[PDB]
RNA sequence: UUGCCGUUGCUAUGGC
């Protein structure tokens, strides 16, 4: 189960990768993608330029969590809920969030690179 | 519909493989191989013999002369017989004694001839698995087998030995150990009109021997529980059944290959089949076999099934669900320990813990139309197989054998249209492998002989 | 509700008895009532099988209270004779226990039977 | 076989450390070989999921793949679905090798005792003495792994050390 | 009269450092660096050893009433 | 024009369409047993090779049948062995895992194109498909 | 103790011969011991020990079994006629050497 | 008709 954020969705649509099919042929496993309410709040706050990205995040195949905090800082929410539990893949393309996630141990990181998704800290990919 | 599409695409596939009755219909390679068939020798052992003795309804049933000769041996275990082409029989017990009988005095009970009793004297002085070359049995002789020619009897049991005794004196001529720690033998069968023995050992192993050469031919592997029973005919095929893996295998022993046959009765679909309008259920353990002919055999299960199997069908052709009854439920004075009959009846849960008798002996007369089943219901059952070979049916019962039937086999007399047989059945008060058997209801350790006629 | 309540039907009974036989071959089965209660209070047990037709029934009904205390699955097979025959000994047993082991070659089968009897229970 | 993408990240090093230590492996090539062909297996099962229901390829190659995976023994009999082939992984494959299986059946005291039993030929599945440790036993050869009858841990004649000590103590 | 060659001219292992018997086998090295690793794992985590062995003797190492080793949320 | 004797059209091919997934489904739904070996007898070089695949034991059975049938040992013919034995054993240790070949799942070859979807009984009429059903 | 099994016994009257396949069984022995095998074959069939012959021996892996090709003659003279000269050099009586030049 | 023991038959049964 993979936590998505907003620039990962934007780079997915910019590189024409499907979310669940890109995840499946990246990991060769069955993926459950998760949009937290703060990532969804960030996509809605991005305005009416990003309508395509918002209604591709509105997808019944993409399940969605319910964050319980004030504010819509998705990087704080993703970092907290991943270092609490260590049962999550983080799909992101922010340089700062990528550095945070790859500094906390045991957390695999997925990112749009080239024309498909790549995964780094998951040691069983083939 | 996905299974319909699977069947349809498989049908189209087979049609396409055919793609890649006239007056001339001859094929060159087939007729050349038939010329080689006309050239060859040995149309003797390899008869694919079908059922040529159709006499099931013919002979009498209900008025057999039944003599239950009780013997003083705790828990007789096996029975071996012999006919040349005087007849001797053999019994063996849990008291480590083999006993030779004469049986040819047909109208009366058998006659004791000779003991051969092992004991604590025969424990080896090593506890080392390949110097097990003593001359007697120190533990639990489970099976005897007489030679088809009658020079030897060969016996073995839980002391992982094969001792081959001479017939005329009951003397151990040769000892062959099974060379490993769990190598207890559980069934022995000579192939008919031969000198080749097939023993089934609890290492998931089947050993084969030539007795008059004192040699082992081939060890063949492949069951998944202990090979509880074995059966063979004149062909070099063999049929074994392992207990809890619920499969019966038959072995091309020169090729060392097999055909497996699993069970597969489920109370869900069976109770639905009855629900279209009932105490029957799944399967515990396939226990006993006898190869009726070289295309069919019959298996005795642990839930009282008797099943009839062909050489050309994985799933069985015919079932018979309850073959000896369901056991008497434990009494209300021996279930609960309360005071009132209402709670002691509530501790029976209705019908949920009634368990069926399990068929612990099955014998098909070779190539014939009739087989005999036995358990501790007290009454042997005689069944005949229908002439189209797709069913069998209960003819009659033989109700003079109180106890577990650890072995059934028959002894022939009379000519091609007028025949009489004595059915030997070893009767004990305890199963031939472990004890497990309570409610010993008037049992005795004896030999139930019946004389059936016409 | 009888005393020997969570009884298994025939398919579950044969699944239970097959994994009992395999654990008895793999030395992972402690058989008998007081050996079962010994391994139960020691905590090395994955599920306990009681037979629901022995000559008293409270003789093994002492064990469901222990299993409940320590949260261990317990299941009632309707034949002590078949249970002993599956255990591989020459006598009927009335209770048996599958001890825990992680160098065990039947761990998936034991876990599947545990899940089946726990959804039963 | 083939090397992984990032072969030197610390998760991969601790992964291979746990795998080689828990299964007694000699180097990285065991993990890399069995993971390469597992990658082929579930890269195929991914495509069998990306095609639809009632596709001929999906029906026939799917039940073919799960039946020969069940007969290799990495997949149990009841999960006859095709997403469990994706849930499959590398230690499910190298729990099936003969060294792991000899230790789990208890003919040896550790995986290293199992490896030296196998390479010293005391272990025979079925009829033949197997002597390489990475053998991938199947669900029918799972129960005939026993000591070879040609070996002193079976029932055979004891080896040279035992018989030379017996002879020198007889002198 | 045959001046046979010896081991240092034969195998020609000129001037090597002292090396390891555990490095002479690739399998025993990973056996002994996994034993080291799973002895270090007892230091970082607390490892489930297998439950209560005999009678509960006590904590055998101390009880700290000030330390709380539990993960707080956010 | 005129006829010309064509052994390539009255020769038994049966191998352009022999697919292992269809054959495995037929072995599953066959309802007659399959002649499997006693379980140790089919591994090859003490485990240095594989077990052996189903096609390899079929080919071995054919070779031993021809062997006993005309009393001749086969040989170490260099060109054919340097092709077939080495390429066969290297793809065996590539794709045969535990007696089962998984090479097919890594291979593009359409099932329904060649081996399904009948060509002779194509039923290109509504009336012909109606008579083929009824 | 070695053990013998003949299979698929056919008769060749054109070569005055009877031929078959030979499953030779030697548990805990090395191999077929071909002269002793000709003895055992010549006594299970009729006498003709210089007219019984075996040539095609293949032992399977792990020992125990070996499949050979057995052909037995009547009339040792016509066996000498019909057998090839290298097998006669191997087993029987013939010995003619080739001229060693060039 | 057997390891004992009981009815036994002048042969069948039943308790360990
Ligand atoms: Zn949030």
Swiss-Prot record, chain A:
- What's one GO MF term for it? RNA endonuclease activity
One GO cellular component, as annotated: small-subunit processome
One GO BP on record is:
endonucleolytic cleavage in ITS1 to separate SSU-rRNA from 5.8S rRNA and LSU-rRNA from tricistronic rRNA transcript (SSU-rRNA, 5.8S rRNA, LSU-rRNA)
Q: Where is the PINc domain?
A: 1-99
The principal location of this protein is nucleus
Q: Which UniProt keywords apply?
A: Nucleus, Ribosome biogenesis, rRNA processing
Kindly indicate whether the keyword NAD belongs to this entry. Answer: no
Q: Where is this chain's protein located in or outside the cell?
A: Nucleus, Nucleolus
Report the leader peptide range.
none
Superkingdom to which the source organism belongs: Eukaryota
Indicate the family of this protein: Belongs to the UTP23/FCF1 family. FCF1 subfamily.
- Assembly and partners? Interacts with FAF1.
Cited function: Essential protein involved in pre-rRNA processing and 40S ribosomal subunit assembly. Required for the early cleavage steps of 35S rRNA at the A(0), A(1), and A(2) sites.
The entry's protein name is: rRNA-processing protein FCF1
Originating gene: FCF1
Q: Which residues of the full protein are shown?
A: 64 to 189 of 189
Curated annotation (Swiss-Prot), chain C:
CDD domains in UniProt: SNU13
Keyword rRNA processing among record annotations:
yes
Outcome of swapping residue 77 to L: Impairs binding to U4 snRNA, but not U3 snoRNA, and causes pre rRNA processing defects and an accumulation of unspliced U3 snoRNA
Question: Which Pfam families does the protein's record reference?
Answer: Ribosomal_L7Ae (PF01248)
- Reported effect, residue 80 to A: Impairs binding to U4 snRNA, but not U3 snoRNA, and causes pre rRNA processing defects and an accumulation of unspliced U3 snoRNA
Q: Which UniProt keywords apply?
A: mRNA processing, mRNA splicing, Nucleus, Ribonucleoprotein, Ribosome biogenesis, RNA-binding, rRNA processing, Spliceosome
Q: Supply one GO BP term.
A: mRNA splicing, via spliceosome
Which molecular-function annotation in GO is an example for this chain? Answer: RNA binding
Q: Identify the GO cellular component terms for this protein.
A: box C/D methylation guide snoRNP complex; nucleolus; nucleoplasm; nucleus; precatalytic spliceosome; small-subunit processome; spliceosomal complex; U4 snRNP
At the top level, the lineage of the source is Eukaryota
Q: Where in the cell is it found?
A: Nucleus, Nucleolus
Q: What do we know about how this protein assembles, alone or with others?
A: Binds to the C'/D and B/C motifs in U3 snoRNA. Component of the U4/U6-U5 tri-snRNP complex composed of the U4, U6 and U5 snRNAs and at least PRP3, PRP4, PRP6, PRP8, PRP18, PRP31, PRP38, SNU13, SNU23, SNU66, SNU114, SPP381, SMB1, SMD1, SMD2, SMD3, SMX2, SMX3, LSM2, LSM3, LSM4, LSM5, LSM6, LSM7, LSM8, BRR2 and DIB1. Binds to the 5'-stem-loop of U4 snRNA. Component of the ribosomal small subunit (SSU) processome composed of at least 40 protein subunits and snoRNA U3.
> What protein family does this chain belong to?
Belongs to the eukaryotic ribosomal protein eL8 family.
The protein in question is named 13 kDa ribonucleoprotein-associated protein
Source gene? SNU13
Curated annotation (Swiss-Prot), chain D:
Q: Does the keyword Ubl conjugation apply?
A: yes
Every copy of the S4 RNA-binding domain together lies at: 96-170
Q: What is its main location?
A: cytoplasm
In terms of InterPro entries, this protein maps to: Ribosomal_uS4, Ribosomal_uS4_CS, Ribosomal_uS4_euk/arc, Ribosomal_uS4_N, S4_RNA-bd, S4_RNA-bd_sf
The terms under GO molecular function for this entry are: rRNA binding; structural constituent of ribosome
Keyword terms: Cytoplasm, Isopeptide bond, Nucleus, Phosphoprotein, Ribonucleoprotein, Ribosomal protein, Ribosome biogenesis, RNA-binding, rRNA processing, rRNA-binding, Ubl conjugation
What positions does the cross-link Glycyl lysine isopeptide (Lys-Gly) (interchain with G-Cter in ubiquitin) connect?
Answer: 169
Q: Which Gene3D superfamilies does this UniProt record tie to the protein?
A: RNA-binding S4 domain (3.10.290.10)
Localization, UniProt: Cytoplasm; Nucleus, Nucleolus
Offer a single GO CC term for the protein. Answer: nucleoplasm
Q: Where is this region: Disordered?
A: 149-171
Q: Name one Pfam family in it.
A: S4
Cite a single GO BP annotation. ribosomal small subunit biogenesis
What SMART domains does the entry give? Ribosomal_S4 (SM01390), S4 (SM00363)
Assembly description: Component of the small ribosomal subunit (SSU). Mature yeast ribosomes consist of a small (40S) and a large (60S) subunit. The 40S small subunit contains 1 molecule of ribosomal RNA (18S rRNA) and 33 different proteins (encoded by 57 genes). The large 60S subunit contains 3 rRNA molecules (25S, 5.8S and 5S rRNA) and 46 different proteins (encoded by 81 genes). Interacts with snoRNA U3. uS11 interacts with MPP10. Component of the ribosomal small subunit (SSU) processome composed of at least 40 protein subunits and snoRNA U3.
UniProt lists the family membership as follows: Belongs to the universal ribosomal protein uS4 family.
Q: What else is known?
A: Present with 106000 molecules/cell in log phase SD medium. There are 2 genes for uS4 in yeast.
What name does the UniProt record give this protein? Small ribosomal subunit protein uS4A
Swiss-Prot record, chain E:
- Comp. bias (Basic residues): 26-43
* Signal peptide coordinates: none
Q: Where in the cell is it found?
A: Nucleus, Nucleolus
Region annotated Disordered, chain positions: 13-43
Described by its record, this protein's role is as follows: Primarily required at the G2/M phase. Essential for viability: involved in nucleolar processing of pre-18S ribosomal RNA as part of the ribosomal small subunit (SSU) processome.
Q: How does it assemble?
A: Interacts with snoRNA U3. Interacts with MPP10. Component of the ribosomal small subunit (SSU) processome composed of at least 40 protein subunits and snoRNA U3.
Further remark, if any? When overexpressed, has a role in the structure of silenced chromatin. Overproduction causes derepression of gene expression at both HML and HMR, as well as at the rDNA locus and at telomeres.
The record's family statement is: Belongs to the SAS10 family.
Q: What is this protein called?
A: Something about silencing protein 10
Organism the protein comes from = Saccharomyces cerevisiae (strain ATCC 204508 / S288c)
């Amino acid at each position: 189960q993979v936590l998505i954020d907003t620039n990962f969705i934007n780079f997915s649509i910019q590189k024409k990768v499907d979310i669940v099919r890109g995840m499946m042929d990246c990991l060769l496993a069955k993926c459950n993608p998760l949009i937290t309410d703060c990532v969804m709040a960030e996509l809605e706050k991005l305005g009416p330029k990003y309508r395509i990205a918002l209604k591709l995040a509105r997808d019944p195949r993409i399940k969605r969590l319910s964050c319980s905090h004030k504010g819509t800082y998705a990087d704080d929410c993703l970092v907290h809920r991943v270092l609490q539990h260590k049962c999550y893949i983080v799909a992101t393309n922010d340089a700062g969030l990528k550095q945070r996630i790859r500094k906390i141990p045991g957390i695999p990181l997925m990112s749009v690179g080239g024309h498909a998704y790549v995964i780094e800290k998951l040691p069983d990919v083939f | 519909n996905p299974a319909d599409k699977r069947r349809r695409l498989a049908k189209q596939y087979l049609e396409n493989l055919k793609s890649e009755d006239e007056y001339n219909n001859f094929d060159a390679g087939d007729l050349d191989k038939d010329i080689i068939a006309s050239r060859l020798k040995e149309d003797v052992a390899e008869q694919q013999g079908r059922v040529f003795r159709y006499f099931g309804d013919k002979l009498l049933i209900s008025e057999a002369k039944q003599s239950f000769t009780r013997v003083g041996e705790n828990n007789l275990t096996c029975i071996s017989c012999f006919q040349p082409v005087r007849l001797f029989a053999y019994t063996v017990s849990k008291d480590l004694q083999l006993t030779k009988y004469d049986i040819t005095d047909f109208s009366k009970r058998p006659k004791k001839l000779k003991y051969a009793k092992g004991g604590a004297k025969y424990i080896p002085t090593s506890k080392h698995e390949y110097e097990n070359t003593t001359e007697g049995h120190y533990d639990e002789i489970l099976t005897v087998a007489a030679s088809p020619d009658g020079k030897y009897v060969v016996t073995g049991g839980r002391d992982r030995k094969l001792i081959v005794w001479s017939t005329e004196s009951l003397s151990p001529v040769k000892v062959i150990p099974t060379k490993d720690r769990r190598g207890e033998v559980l069934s022995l069968a000579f192939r008919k009109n031969s000198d080749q023995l097939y023993a089934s050992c609890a290492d998931f192993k089947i050993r084969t021997y030539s007795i008059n050469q004192f040699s082992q031919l081939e060890i063949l592997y492949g069951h998944h529980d202990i090979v509880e029973d074995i059966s063979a005919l004149a062909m070099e095929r063999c049929v074994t059944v392992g207990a809890r893996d619920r499969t019966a295998m038959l072995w091309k022993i020169p090729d060392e290959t097999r055909l497996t046959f699993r069970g597969g009765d489920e109370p869900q679909k069976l109770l639905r089949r009855w629900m279209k309008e009932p105490l029957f259920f799944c399967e515990g353990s396939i226990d006993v076999v006898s190869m009726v002919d070289d295309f069919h055999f019959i298996t005795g299960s642990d839930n009282g099934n008797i099943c009839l199997w062909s050489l050309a069908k994985k799933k069985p052709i015919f079932t018979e669900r309850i073959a000896h009854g369901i056991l008497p439920e434990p009494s209300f004075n021996d279930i609960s320990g309360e005071t009132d009959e209402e709670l002691r009846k509530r501790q029976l849960q209705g019908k949920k813990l009634l368990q069926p008798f399990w068929i612990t002996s099955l014998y098909a007369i070779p190539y014939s139309n009739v087989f005999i089943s036995g358990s501790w219901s007290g009454s042997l059952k005689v069944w005949k197989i229908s002439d189209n070979l797709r069913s069998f049916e209960l003819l009659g019962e033989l109700s003079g054998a109180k106890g577990v039937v650890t072995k059934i086999q028959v002894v022939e007399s009379g000519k091609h249209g007028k025949e009489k047989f004595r059915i030997l059945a070893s009767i004990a008060k305890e199963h031939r492998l472990g004890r497990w058997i309570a409610n010993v209801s008037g049992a005795r350790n004896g030999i139930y002989s019946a004389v059936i006629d016409q | 509700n009888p005393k020997a309540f969570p009884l298994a039907d025939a398919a579950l009974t044969q699944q239970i008895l097959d994994v009992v036989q395999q654990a008895a071959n793999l030395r992972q089965l402690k058989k008998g009532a007081n050996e079962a209660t010994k391994t139960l209070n020691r905590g090395i047990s994955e599920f306990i099988i009681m037979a629901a037709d022995c000559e008293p029934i409270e003789i093994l009904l002492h064990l469901p209270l222990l299993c409940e205390d320590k949260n261990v699955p317990y299941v009632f097979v309707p034949s002590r004779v078949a249970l002993g025959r599956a255990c591989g000994v020459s006598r009927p047993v009335i209770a048996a226990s599958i001890t825990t082991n992680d160098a065990s070659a039947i761990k998936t089968q034991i876990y599947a039977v545990k899940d089946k009897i726990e959804t039963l229970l | 076989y083939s090397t992984p993408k990032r072969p030197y990240e610390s998760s991969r090093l601790d992964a291979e450390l746990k795998l080689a230590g828990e299964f007694g492996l000699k180097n990285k090539k065991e993990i890399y070989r069995i993971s390469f062909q597992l990658s082929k297996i579930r890269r195929a099962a991914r495509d069998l999921l990306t095609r639809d229901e009632k596709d001929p390829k999906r029906l026939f190659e799917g039940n073919a793949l799960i039946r020969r995976l069940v007969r290799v023994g990495v997949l149990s009999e009841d999960k006859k679905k095709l997403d469990y082939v994706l849930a499959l992984k590398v230690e499910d494959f190298l729990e099936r090798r003969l060294q792991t299986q000899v230790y789990k059946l208890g003919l040896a005291k550790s995986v290293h005792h199992a490896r030296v039993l196998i390479t010293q030929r005391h272990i025979a599945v079925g009829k033949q003495i197997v002597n390489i440790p990475s053998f991938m036993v199947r669900l029918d050869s799972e129960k005939h792994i026993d000591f070879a009858p040609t070996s002193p841990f079976g029932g055979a004649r004891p080896g040279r050390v035992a018989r030379r000590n017996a002879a020198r103590k007889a002198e | 009269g045959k001046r046979a060659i010896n081991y240092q001219i034969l195998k020609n292992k000129g001037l090597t450092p002292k090396r390891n018997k555990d490095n002479r086998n690739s399998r025993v090295k990973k056996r002994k660096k996994y034993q080291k690793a799973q002895k270090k794992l007892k230091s970082v985590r607390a490892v489930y050893s297998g439950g209560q062995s005999g009678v509960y003797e006590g904590e055998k190492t101390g009880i700290k009433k000030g330390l709380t080793r539990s993960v707080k949320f956010k | 024009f005129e006829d010309r004797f064509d052994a390539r059209e009255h020769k038994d091919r049966s191998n352009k369409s022999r697919m292992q997934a269809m054959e495995e489904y037929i072995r599953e739904s066959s309802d007659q047993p399959d002649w499997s070996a006693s379980i140790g007898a089919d591994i090859v070089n003490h485990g240095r090779g594989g077990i052996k695949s189903l096609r390899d034991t079929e080919k071995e059975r054919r070779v031993t049948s021809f062997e006993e049938d005309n009393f001749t040992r086969l040989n170490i013919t260099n060109k054919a062995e340097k092709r077939k034995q080495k390429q066969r054993e290297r793809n065996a240790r590539m794709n045969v895992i535990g007696g089962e070949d998984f090479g097919i799942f890594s291979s593009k070859r359409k099932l329904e194109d060649s081996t399904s979807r009948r060509g002779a009984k194509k039923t290109r009429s509504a009336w012909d498909r109606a008579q083929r059903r009824l | 103790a070695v053990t013998i099994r003949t299979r698929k016994v056919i008769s060749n009257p054109l070569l005055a011969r009877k031929q078959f396949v030979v499953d030779v069984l030697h548990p805990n022995r090395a191999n077929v011991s071909k002269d002793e095998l000709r003895e055992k074959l010549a006594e299970v069939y009729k006498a003709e020990k210089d007219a019984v012959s075996v040539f095609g021996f293949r032992t399977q892996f792990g020992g125990g079994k070996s499949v050979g090709f057995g052909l037995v003659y009547n009339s040792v003279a016509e066996a000498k006629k019909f057998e090839p000269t290298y097998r006669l050099v191997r087993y029987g009586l013939a010995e003619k050497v080739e001229k060693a030049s060039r």
